[model samples]
Target: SEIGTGFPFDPHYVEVLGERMHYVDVGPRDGTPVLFLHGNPTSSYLWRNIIPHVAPSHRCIAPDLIGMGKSDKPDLDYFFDDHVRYLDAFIEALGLEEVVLVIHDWGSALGFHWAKRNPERVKGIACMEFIRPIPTWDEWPEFARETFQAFRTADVGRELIIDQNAFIEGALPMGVVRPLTEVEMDHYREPFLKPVDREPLWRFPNELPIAGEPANIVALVEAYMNWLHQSPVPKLLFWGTPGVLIPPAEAARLAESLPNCKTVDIGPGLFLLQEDNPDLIGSEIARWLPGLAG
Candidate 1:
């Protein structure tokens, strides 16, 4: 699939799981590679600003998960397992190793899961606005619980997410600290303009760690958490105010589990912090990489 003229990088695709997966491969081929994975409703464009900050010094590779961005859309239900399979294949297809993974939202979950299983391939991790599984619903805040309930409600979820494409139309803008310009919004909405292409978006919210419906995903996350506690790789957690996921308490808990981790407060923003807080995030990761490299 060709990337729109708005994006600077040309599109690249590799077949994974019988589907065409899209990604942007930039910077020096032999330099250290930084794998940037974006969450739902947004594609590799999510990292456009941040990539340049590190690209001069490292290779920047960002992929659109199956059924999102310029990637081929499969008829399958875009479940966590489906994403993991495609991602696992994508990494192997490209022969990515000694990678520094930067992730947000579902990207965090997917990247962490992959790193845990392939720890030797991973060199370090930088994450933001991502969810980790909690032992129970009791661990979530009241607001978080209500939001997950709404997303899990079949009728309500399908109507808003699938029928209206609300995540792209509404939720995404609401999460960003600043409203996206019309052109920016158009690019984000391009992939899922049709209802058929919106299935991936619809299924993502449903897969949130809620109601135990996706029991396997919850278990997978727990396993990754166990690995996180034991892994020695350097990690950096960039967080912000008004962040919907990874609140202070959860971030503290994660810090405790990651032995060689550092936490940075990037100031006020919401789930899509990259939209509003790119400079801080970009510079912080760029600065932190030297220590990891050393």
Candidate 2:
């Protein structure tokens, strides 16, 4: 299931879960590795800019989750658990260990699921716009549920969402109080240029764990809980103040449990922790990572 890859990056493929998955395996071949995982409406493309920012001293491997990016997008049923299964297979296939994971959105859920189950392999965790959706969306803010419901049950929801490259790119400039470069915008939109290319888009909104109906959601919540309650991976929460998906309370909850987890609010931009507000958070990572390298 090899697909022709585009420019500014090369195609790296490996067989995982019987599919030829595509990924961008960049940076020094022998450098310590960092895994960048993206959430909904994005591919590994989300890390296009960030990778280079840290690649000089790290082997940055960013994979497009199955059904997204240039990976094998099958029409089979997809679930949150299914994603972890595929990624676990991916890690084993690549023999990746001592990985420093950077997750955003769905990546946060999937990465934590795997990291908690195999904590020794994970060295540290960093996140942006992460959602550990619980059965208790009822406990969530009214505006949050309304926004969640719109994606889950509205008409404009499906059509507008099923092809969301531009919509996602829009968020960076819209949510952030700063301007973005043309090059930066290209990094976000390079993957899903066509509606048909966004097959993975349909699976995400359709599978959200609203009202706790989906069995996969139950398992995902359980995994997230274990990670929240048990995992000891050193964490850094670079939260965005105005990101609609995750509010300050969520960051506070994560920080309280993972008491060592430091929260650095760098203004507003859902996933553009690098683009919107890179200085403080970026400097912290760069300063801390070398000392944590073990």
Best by lDDT: 1
Candidate 2 local lDDT, 123-172, one digit each (tens): 88877776666556764446345544655665556565555543455434
What candidate 1 gets wrong by more than 4 Å, as runs, is: 1-6, 134-148, 211-213
RMSD of 1: 3.5
Tens digits of per-residue lDDT for model 1 on 1-294? 121226788789998878888999988898579999999879998998888788878888999999999999889898988888889899989987678999998998899998988888888899998867755676554644665566568789877877888888877887777768888998898898788788888788878775465787778777887898889999999887757777776777777778899988877777788887788788888998777665
TM-score for candidate 1? 0.92
Per-model lDDT: 0.82, 0.68
TM-score of each: 0.92, 0.81
Q: What is the lDDT of candidate 2?
A: 0.68
Q: Candidate 2: where are CA atoms >4 Å away?
A: 1-7, 134-147, 154-156, 163-194
